[PDB]
Amino acid sequence: VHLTPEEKSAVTALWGKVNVDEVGGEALGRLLVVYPWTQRFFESFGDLSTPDAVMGNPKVKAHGKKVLGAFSDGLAHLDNLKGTFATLSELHCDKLHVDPENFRLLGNVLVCVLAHHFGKEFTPPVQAAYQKVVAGVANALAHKYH
Amino acid sequence: VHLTPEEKSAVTALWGKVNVDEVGGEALGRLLVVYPWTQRFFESFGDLSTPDAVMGNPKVKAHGKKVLGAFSDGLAHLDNLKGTFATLSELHCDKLHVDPENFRLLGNVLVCVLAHHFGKEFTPPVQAAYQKVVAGVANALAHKYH
Amino acid sequence: VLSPADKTNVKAAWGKVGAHAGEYGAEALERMFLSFPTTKTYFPHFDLSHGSAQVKGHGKKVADALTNAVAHVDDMPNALSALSDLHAHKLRVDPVNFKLLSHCLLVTLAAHLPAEFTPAVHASLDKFLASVSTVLTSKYR
Amino acid sequence: VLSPADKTNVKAAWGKVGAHAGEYGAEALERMFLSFPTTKTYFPHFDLSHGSAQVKGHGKKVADALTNAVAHVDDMPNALSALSDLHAHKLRVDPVNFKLLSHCLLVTLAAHLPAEFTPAVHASLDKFLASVSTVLTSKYR
Ligand code: HEM
Ligand code: HEM
Ligand code: HEM
Ligand code: HEM
Numbered sequence: 001v002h003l004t005p006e007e008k009s010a011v012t013a014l015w016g017k018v019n020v021d022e023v024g025g026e027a028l029g030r031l032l033v034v035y036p037w038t039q040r041f042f043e044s045f046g047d048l049s050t051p052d053a054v055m056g057n058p059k060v061k062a063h064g065k066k067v068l069g070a071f072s073d074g075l076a077h078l079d080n081l082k083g084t085f086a087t088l089s090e091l092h093c094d095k096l097h098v099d100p101e102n103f104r105l106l107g108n109v110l111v112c113v114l115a116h117h118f119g120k121e122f123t124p125p126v127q128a129a130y131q132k133v134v135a136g137v138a139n140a141l142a143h144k145y146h
Numbered sequence: 147v148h149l150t151p152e153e154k155s156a157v158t159a160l161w162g163k164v165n166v167d168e169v170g171g172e173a174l175g176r177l178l179v180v181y182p183w184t185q186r187f188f189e190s191f192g193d194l195s196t197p198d199a200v201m202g203n204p205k206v207k208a209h210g211k212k213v214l215g216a217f218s219d220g221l222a223h224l225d226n227l228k229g230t231f232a233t234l235s236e237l238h239c240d241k242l243h244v245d246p247e248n249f250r251l252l253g254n255v256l257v258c259v260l261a262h263h264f265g266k267e268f269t270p271p272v273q274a275a276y277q278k279v280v281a282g283v284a285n286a287l288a289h290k291y292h
Numbered sequence: 293v294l295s296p297a298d299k300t301n302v303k304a305a306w307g308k309v310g311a312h313a314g315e316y317g318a319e320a321l322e323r324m325f326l327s328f329p330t331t332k333t334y335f336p337h338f339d340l341s342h343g344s345a346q347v348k349g350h351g352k353k354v355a356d357a358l359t360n361a362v363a364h365v366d367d368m369p370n371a372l373s374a375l376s377d378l379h380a381h382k383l384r385v386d387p388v389n390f391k392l393l394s395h396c397l398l399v400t401l402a403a404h405l406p407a408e409f410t411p412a413v414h415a416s417l418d419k420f421l422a423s424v425s426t427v428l429t430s431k432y433r
Numbered sequence: 434v435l436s437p438a439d440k441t442n443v444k445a446a447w448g449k450v451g452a453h454a455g456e457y458g459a460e461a462l463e464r465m466f467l468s469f470p471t472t473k474t475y476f477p478h479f480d481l482s483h484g485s486a487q488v489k490g491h492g493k494k495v496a497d498a499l500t501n502a503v504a505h506v507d508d509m510p511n512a513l514s515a516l517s518d519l520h521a522h523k524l525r526v527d528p529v530n531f532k533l534l535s536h537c538l539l540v541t542l543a544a545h546l547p548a549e550f551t552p553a554v555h556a557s558l559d560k561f562l563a564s565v566s567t568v569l570t571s572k573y574r
């Protein structure tokens with residue numbers, strides 16, 4: 001994605017403050033609660049019967065760290081998302097068969113989590129930068145069709 | 147862009163029977179009637195106030211012939227839809243900013259129109275083959291968005 | 293949201309479909325399974341071969357649920373609560389699949405109604421199916 | 434379709450906005466304009482600079498419409514008919530733009546109401562904005 005030098009700096013600055021052990025699980029848990037049909041993909045994670053069970057589910061939190069990890073990787077290779085997410089793209093498109101519209105949903109839930117955690121610090125321009133970032137990641141994961 | 151040798155044949159055989167002067171205008175007209183917001187991009191076309199106005203609009207009909215021509219183009223270069231639609235992708239994405247979900251709508255509306263013209267001859271396998279073509283064209287047009 | 297005219301169009305068109313509704317629901321399912329094979333993952337226990345009696349039988353159920361929706365077009369959430377429970381709370385069908393089935397049903401009507409599948413009817417039916425899809429993908433208990 | 438709990442959730446969270454209506458509405462629009470520039474084409478004549486008084490004025494109209502929709506959560510088509518006339522009949526706004534503004538509204542609520550913006554409430558608000566968007570993009574008059 002084409003981030004502005006200013007944007008790139010603001011994005012990296014905020015990300016450095018993200019709790020890598022919790023943010024991904026919070027975003028994934030919210031995806032499952034806000035867009036409930038997504039729970040179908042994670043039925044092997046156990047109890048996802050209510051919002052509290054989803055948010056408190058150990059496997060959701062553990063898996064969320066891996067998802068946050070992939071987002072960090074994307075942040076480090078904004079220049080070539082397509083190639084960075086090639087393996088994940090094949091997984092989600094061929095193995096998982098997740099409709100691409102869902103990738104955009106997780107990216108936007110992640111943005112809501114950043115806003116929730118950083119409050120006023122997640123300014124409109126900072127959000128605009130992150131929106132390019134997550135659209136890039138979503139676009140990179142949907143390339144197996146694209 | 148799959149298209150088993152047999153699907154490619156099926157698609158080719160059906161297209162040869164497609165009325166070049168009208169099918170494109172029926173597809174665009176039905177898009178304008180079924181998904182009314184699409185009318186926003188065609189204000190210079192004239193009266194689109196009622197389904198009869200829309201379906202009989204001479205500009206819609208004239209313009210649809212070009213739309214159908216582009217689909218013909220894709221069918222004639224099924225293995226390189228991205229190149230075939232590059233110019234149009236830039237026109238629709240960067241200049242008109244048409245949201246890409248609408249390319250999918252038009253493609254499916256075109257399928258409805260083919261089914262409407264061919265009846266029983268538009269069999270589920272013939273349709274499966276055309277769904278690949280229209281998904282391919284829409285993806286090709288949304289490419290600038292990649 | 294359907295207008296008063298959409299409602300008249302839906303009742304009139306479904307009326308024209310008449311006794312063929314079951315057949316059309318079965319063909320819409322067949323078309324969907326062939327065109328978008330990932331939808332088949334929702335029916336692992338079904339015989340899904342062309343002409344399968346199980347698909348013909350399930351198409352009649354889908355058609356009867358739609359006939360019911362047409363008859364309660366003013367309050368579909370109430371009328372389809374059991375089906376919403378099934379698709380949204382139990383099966384968790386991704387809404388994209390409802391778009392696929394709605395499209396296959398419109399393709400089926402188009403192939404069968406060359407004299408009655410007018411642009412206005414097509415428009416009203418498309419919204420009606422978007423309306424049913426919203427109810428079946430929402431948890432509102 | 435909203436569950437009883439969704440309505441409860443929505444009225445409780447939005448009731449917290451109160452006199453912040455204008456400010457939050459403006460912030461949501463600014464976030465949208467900046468994050469998804471294609472949406473500015475619907476306001477070609479507006480002064481959209483940061484802090485614009487035009488956007489601040491428009492943002493209060495939008496939030497108060499949401500306030501009115503929350504009050505009439507069980508009867509939205511009737512309550513928002515004038516807004517539907519505007520967005521679906523006159524402006525012809527593409528439904529995708531409603532998802533963008535809805536997302537910017539949720540981002541704005543999350544940045545300001547951390548305690549209130551729980552997963553459950555976030556879910557109810559998202560569905561509510563989707564309900565609102567369906568009414569404003571439908572022609573039912
Ligand atoms: C757009 C951002 C996304 C990113 C960055 C992401 C990242 C990942 C990663 C890192 C893995 C682990 C890969 C591995 O272990 O080899 C994974 C697995 C998985 N993802 Fe995603 N994902 C995305 C979106 C989604 C969405 C939207 C869905 C479903 C609605 C989904 C469903 C899955 C499933 C079910 C697995 C396998 C989990 C398991 O059972 O182990 N992902 N994803
Ligand atoms: C997926 C199928 C689509 C194809 C193949 C297609 C094809 C075309 C073609 C060939 C042109 C003529 C270009 C020229 O003469 O320079 C064009 C123009 C245009 N298309 Fe499309 N188009 C598609 C979808 C859409 C959709 C979904 C919309 C908007 C809802 C749209 C809106 C327009 C507009 C506004 C123009 C310019 C019209 C004018 O001259 O005023 N197109 N399209
Ligand atoms: C207009 C949309 C739809 C309508 C009206 C509808 C209607 C029905 C009805 C009447 C049933 C049977 C309930 C019973 O047994 O009494 C059913 C079951 C079911 N539907 Fe749907 N459905 C719709 C869309 C879909 C979609 C798009 C999917 C997924 C691709 C789906 C998956 C299922 C499954 C998996 C069952 C249970 C089948 C079984 O194992 O017996 N449905 N549906
Ligand atoms: C939750 C969804 C929305 C709400 C509740 C909402 C509500 C409103 C209201 C109350 C008006 C003000 C009319 C007045 O001055 O009295 C308005 C006008 C307008 N809205 Fe929306 N709106 C929504 C979404 C959108 C979206 C997504 C767009 C476009 C991206 C849009 C474009 C417009 C424009 C163009 C006007 C007219 C502005 C002008 O020329 O003065 N609206 N909206």
Ligand SMILES: *Cc1ccc(OC)c(OCc2ccccn2)c1
Pocket residue numbers: 180181182293294418419422423426567570571
């Ligand atoms: C009445 C109605 C119900 C559900 C919709 O979307 C889920 C809806 O959107 C507007 C629309 C849908 C399909 C065709 C044309 N408009 C309307």
Ligand SMILES: *Cc1ccc(OC)c(OCc2ccccn2)c1
Pocket residue numbers: 034035036426429430434435556559560563564567
């Ligand atoms: C109640 C309701 C109204 C409108 C919808 O879509 C236009 C709708 O879809 C289901 C949903 C939307 C958003 C989040 C979770 N579910 C439901």
Ligand SMILES: COc1ccc(C)cc1OCc1ccccn1
Pocket residue numbers: 181251387388390391392394395418419421422423425426429
């Ligand atoms: C699950 O969602 C849907 C299912 C069937 C239909 C016909 C529309 C749906 O959503 C409305 C829609 C989808 C695409 C474009 C315009 N409107």
Ligand SMILES: COc1ccc(C)cc1OCc1ccccn1
Pocket residue numbers: 035101105387528529531532533535536559560562563564566567570
């Ligand atoms: C105009 O449509 C919408 C407007 C606002 C919102 C919050 C959702 C909408 O659509 C529902 C939706 C969109 C994407 C994925 C799941 N559900």
